[PDB]
Assembly symmetry: C5
Homo-oligomer: 301 residues x 5
């Protein structure tokens, strides 16, 4: 079966149509070639034969002086935006500016929504983890943090690609003039308006990038603080264990003393209770003294 | 209700007025459009129809050849600066230079105050943490350090944005000439003065950025030193525990020896005390010798 | 023996030949010199006397207006690509574009295959390692991860070299015109087509680089999470050991008490069982109470 | 009281004078304004009205075609350089070159001295710390290392500022011509000589920066090695403790066996010594065997 | 004594001479000044009065249209290269190209030898360290790794300096024309040949830099894997110790039980062996059950 695009077409007045068209007929209707409508790049803004070709992660658009076309919109939850919002936006400047503004605004709003969803989860998870009142931390929250960090990295990459794509155009004047397809098709400055639009969207993307970078550095700092807290708790517990170990060592030493003094043999000392009481008292007082001395030895270190 | 701006207006002589004006009337009074007075960017310096539009994190200003306007100043603690200091500053160069210098000086002073407040707290907290006389560190100080580091990152971002915004203007001569609104409105070089002003403020921002970077690297080094100190204390405590464990092992071994020699059974040796004394002495001397040998074995490792 | 190249030659129609030719004869047949056909660089695209010289890690190609030559193809598993696919590709634009597109597509497909093989292994290994249900992790998987990370770094380097080599050409127009060897040999714009080709391949390489960078940052985050999980498990185990140590300390203390009360000597208290029962009960209840008190002391910390 | 500068003035012949002059009189004597002699920047090289204004961290200089002035030299240990070395240096090229060379050489020598003092201390401290013959490290040396690293970061920042300040001038020819104040005051190429001077000093600064960077990376590597050594020692000590713990466990198990066999009750076995000897031998041999088996179990892991 | 250079001179035909000459006579013989033959920079390529001045870490060369001079070659192991290889290389292009190619090839070969020596040692050391079959790692190998990493950093710095020095020349055409001293001394394109030479050597240096960077990242990854392995072994050993501690706790608890039941007092139960056997069996079975329960409690965690 011949390959076919699923196109939805918007007119200047905002009227909407939708159909399925074979690629060869689409090329013939326009002045393009299969070399152009390939969409091999995730992000791209290009001009060919006075036709603008724009692509996002999952959005594909062709802009003409008299119409707009969105391609392969099925199973992407774009119906609400396509049939409810876009016609209102498209209804003194030419059509190209309206269409480009609509698409760029859609992408920017999508990125802003992603960031707004990501931020509170990460902040709350980090706040919960950093609580120094616990000697251990949950691991489900760690898994959540890892997944959200992956999503944040993807968002940063998308923002950087958007910025680079727009900047590549803003620098050269030739592309700025090319985007003014209506002027060239049928021979106030349009280049200035295009520059303003692209500058605005580039600045918004820069702000988003700065926010994401701040979030990432916050994550790193929280991780370091977590490490430090865990190490401190380890040291405290080891100190406690060491103190108890010294106590047990003294107790066992004088337990051996008593066991030796209490063998099932002849000692020639079983007829006196004074010696027994003296031995018990000596054991106890000496255990106290040696424990205190070992505590002091630990303290001096 | 129609949207309205809360404006405070400064004349050339420094006279001050304040009122509330609807946006449409404000656009009509000037030569601007709603596309300009939107303030969608956190930091922006722009020129439109010989009117300068400046924005900061929370400051919004419009500069004309004959007046200055500050918008949305409510609930921002700007009364002291607005009604006490600015009129004195504004009272041979045209008005634009005075206004721009005032605004930039205000922002720079704000950033300097933030940095001056942040520095001593971080320095003292790090000095307290790094003290090697403790095996553990407080965690409230760690939380304070984390919050102050977040604030420091925000400050660094603000400084970088300021530097980039000014540099974008300093490079191009067209914008430098545009900022000289008085010259164009009613046809010594003004561009040189503007270049001097922007260069001065850019250099001050660069100095602040360098200071912040130095503080951050200091924080990182302190964290590494903290880790090392904690690990060393851990190793010392483990060495102590190991020594005591070897002692206890020897004591328990010869305690088992004595217990076996002292069962409630027949041994055919209960009639001699010499054997008992010899056993006790052997136990004690052997415990000493084996403890010393184990200490040597630990030492060789 | 004189050095010799093993060449396979493709004509315009796609006909294929293969032979071995001495370097001097090859230089004489073309207009080149030994200074050119040296291949001292891993990645290089150059033009000399209207002949294109291209090199990859292990691929060496010479492009002329009428023929293509691949050199040193032995023992490299290139037979399938050389004798089955390339002739079909080479069979209105001149030959140079077809040849360059074929070579660049081959290299890009190779890199994509490498990345596609690497990704799932790393993802699955990291997912297995991060599982917080274990207190330890396998080390064979760690070795696998290390080797795959080394391969990923090599891939990133190759992609960066490819991007730099293409970009060095895209910027200058002189090289773009030079690559159009057919135009100069025998005096629609060819430079535009070359720019389109190189831009497409550069963008594909950029996408691959972004993917690799994302994978690397994911690896780093997973490593940090692994460290945190291990530390938490350590702390939990130490807490358990500390609790048991306090219990054992109490038990040994009152064991010493009982041993002292049960020496093989005279105590003047052996005729009463009430004292014995009271001592046993006191030991048990006191052990419980002291264990609870030590647990509370640990809790307060 | 009116603000006053403390100036020391050098003539062309090297004669030296020193006095205190009010700022207004200084401005009047030269052709400058208070906007220039403010010294709000830590590092700055500027030209105003054929007068060169130079600043360092604590050095302030004004250069004219016929004289040099150093401002605010009190309490800075500059007497030796001011009254002993500089006159000799200043005694065919004009005065500006000599003065600038002297100041830049002074700054470069200061930075070189700082680096030469810092290097050996850090190297020796790291060599002492890295010694793998100890399970712990001193902390006073760590504090010293931290302070010296802070000083190194400050030095790196100073070098970077110096390089940037000189480079900003080297690129533009206009500033190079401006620095030739003598040519313009009273109308072989001077710009070439200035370029040579600035290039020489920039290259020296670059060398210093490279040295500092190498030192910093060395510090980082030493820190990592320290961490690894501490962890290895921890593992060794834990292995020793585990072995001793298994031994103690076996000893205590068979101690319980013997204690149970030696209660103060009736066992119907007290009339035979063969059973007693067999029990003792069984306990000892079994303890040896179980200890060996546990050692093997540890080994297999 | 007057300062003197130790020079070795090569003629066009390759004839070699060597002598010692005072600096003033050397300046007079050429057209240079002491400002040039100072060699204050580690790496430098310069042109003065149609004389090329080149410096490396320890190599100093002066190139003229008719001769080459190497200065200060004593005690540097350059005799083999100076008196055996260089004359052969120097024996249609002018002399400058041959001399520059020889010097650059020498430096590149030196760097390649350094890298080839460094690589296998680091690879083998890392392979030995990463072996997960040991709970500890040797420290002599760590010291070796540290020293080799320092050497690698020095090599990277040298390569970067070489690349920067060559690139500074490649960009400007004026320096490329200046290097063609023979053309200017006594009035096919030489600039093209110089560009080819410098491009070749720059590309080789870039390849070396990439290799060094790959080695460094490999080192870092190996360090991280080492940390992870050590932590895992720590956790395993702690688990073993915890299990043995729980066993010992149960044993000591029921040892206290038996000791209490076996005091040297009156219990009114010494006439029955059934109670004794029941107590022993209860102790043993309960110890088994409590040990199993504690193992389950550890497992659930």
């Amino acid at each position: 079966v011949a390959p076919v695009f699923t196109v939805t077409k918007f007119d200047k007045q905002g009227n909407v149509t939708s159909f399925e068209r074979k690629k060869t007929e689409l090329y013939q209707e326009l002045g393009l070639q299969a070399r152009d409508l390939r969409f091999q790049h995730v992000m791209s803004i290009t001009v060919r034969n006075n036709r603008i070709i724009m692509r996002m992660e999952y959005l594909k658009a062709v802009i003409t002086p008299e119409c707009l076309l969105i391609l392969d919109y099925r199973n992407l939850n774009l119906e609400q935006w396509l049939f409810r919002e876009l016609p209102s936006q498209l209804s003194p400047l030419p059509f190209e500016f309206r269409a480009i503004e609509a698409l760029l605004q859609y992408w920017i709003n999508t990125l802003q929504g992603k960031l707004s969803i990501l931020q509170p989860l990460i902040l709350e998870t980090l706040d919960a983890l950093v609580d120094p009142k616990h000697s251990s931390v949950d691991r489900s929250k760690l898994h959540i943090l890892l997944q959200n960090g992956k999503s944040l990295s993807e968002l940063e990459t998308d923002i950087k690609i958007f910025k680079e794509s727009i900047l590549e155009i803003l620098d050269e004047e030739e592309l700025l003039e090319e985007l003014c397809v209506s002027k060239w098709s049928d021979p106030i400055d349009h280049a200035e308006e295009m520059e303003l639009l692209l500058e605005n969207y580039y600045r918004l993307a820069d702000d988003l990038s700065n926010a994401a970078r701040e979030l990432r550095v916050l994550i790193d700092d929280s991780q370091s603080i977590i490490f430090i807290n865990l190490d401190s708790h380890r040291n405290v517990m080891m100190r406690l264990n060491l103190q108890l170990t010294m106590g047990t060592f003294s107790l066992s030493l004088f337990g051996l003393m008593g066991v030796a003094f209490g063998m099932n043999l002849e000692s020639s000392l079983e007829e006196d209770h004074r010696i027994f009481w003296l031995i018990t008292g000596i054991m106890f007082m000496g255990s106290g003294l040696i424990w205190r001395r070992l505590l002091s030895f630990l303290g001096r270190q």
